[PDB]
Design a protein that fits this description.
This protein is 17% helix and 28% strand. The protein has five helices and 17 strands. The strands form three sheets. The chain has a seven-stranded mixed beta sheet with strand order 13-10-11-12-16-15-14. The protein has a six-stranded antiparallel beta sheet with strand order 3-2-5-6-7-8, with no helix packed on it. Strands 4-1-17-9 form a four-stranded mixed beta sheet, with no helix packed on it. It is globular. Residues 124-255 form the Thioester domain. It comes from Streptococcus pyogenes.
Length: 304
């Protein structure tokens, strides 16, 4: 089974962290794409022999390879590897479709966000960080690559939508597994596909899309589903009463005790920390490989 060892800096996933001296029980230096290793079945340990400058030594990672599957093992618990990522990081395009015009109530929603799948199709995505920059504007609705993607200024890593709590700025939740369940349930009952059947009476596709986006913000950024609070909140002032009631339905479903009906979703992380990460609406496992992810805490010593 193929694995890629990747070193990251906690709180800034815009690039891999190079210069970490790492040891697999092989010694190597963490690089910018990852260290590829084909391994047969057994139990392995990754140890940071030396951190880069300004970073602390991370705890060792124990993982098991067994029959084409990888499992991370932390304190009496064995879980399927949460980190499944594309081999070429920061190489996928996402865009905001400026060609698409459709009102939320009276104004253009103007938040029609998409990611490009490997085969050139597109999937609806939602912003995961209300305060950060939306994916590059595309005047022609994704038909051509934006200059931000082509120049390499804004590109995304496609990962499996697991271990997502770390990407949030003001999470409502305190438990990452509960958080993941909430997110998967909003997506499940929300707007997933152009042309889908909208079952809520009177609602348009754009209105369900908006309600879905706000329901995501409810969990990622602790947005309040209150008309008076939404007045000046990222355009949601234009959301009508019926549409906010559906946002509330999405949230209340997500919060209920039932397990998510879907399994895994695509997620996308930018190579620019000013840009939002994005939660997807589809699942493309074909390009994802097992990552052994290790993350380093930056030190912050007061300059005296």
């Amino acid at each position: 089974t193929s694995v890629l060892i990747r070193k990251y800096a906690i709180g800034d996933y815009s690039k891999l962290l190079e210069g970490a001296t790492l040891q697999l029980t092989r010694v190597f230096s963490s690089n910018d794409i990852g260290e590829r290793i084909e391994l047969s079945d057994g139990t392995y340990t990754l140890t940071e022999l030396n951190s880069p400058a300004g970073y602390s030594i991370a705890e060792p990672i124990t993982f098991k390879v067994e029959a084409g599957k990888v499992y991370t093992i932390i304190d009496g618990k064995q879980i399927e590897n949460p980190n499944k990522e594309i081999v070429e990081p920061y190489s996928v395009e996402a865009y905001n479709d400026f060609e698409e015009f459709s009102v939320l109530t009276t104004q253009n929603y103007a938040k029609f966000y998409y990611a490009k799948n490997k085969n050139g199709s597109s999937q609806v995505v939602y912003c995961f960080n209300a305060d950060l920059k939306s994916p590059p504007d595309s005047e022609d609705g994704g038909k051509t690559m934006t200059p931000d993607f082509t120049t390499g200024e804004v590109k995304y890593t496609h990962i499996a939508g697991r271990d997502l709590f770390k990407y949030t700025v003001k999470p409502r939740d305190t438990d990452p597994d509960t958080f993941l369940k909430h997110i998967k349930k909003v997506i499940e009952k929300g707007y997933r596909e152009k042309g889908q059947a909208i079952e809520y009476s009177g609602l348009t596709e754009t209105q369900l899309r908006a309600a879905t986006q706000l329901a995501i913000y409810y969990f990622t950024d602790s947005a309040e589903l209150d008309k008076d609070k939404l007045k000046d909140y990222h355009g949601f002032g234009d959301m009508n009463d019926s549409t906010l009631a559906v946002a509330k339905i999405l949230v209340e479903y997500a919060q209920d005790s039932n397990p998510p009906q879907l399994t895994d979703l695509d997620f996308f992380i930018p190579n620019n920390n000013k840009y939002q990460s994005l939660i997807g609406t589809q699942w493309h496992p074909e390009d994802l490989v097992d990552i052994i992810r290790m993350e380093d805490k930056k030190e912050v010593i007061p300059v005296t």
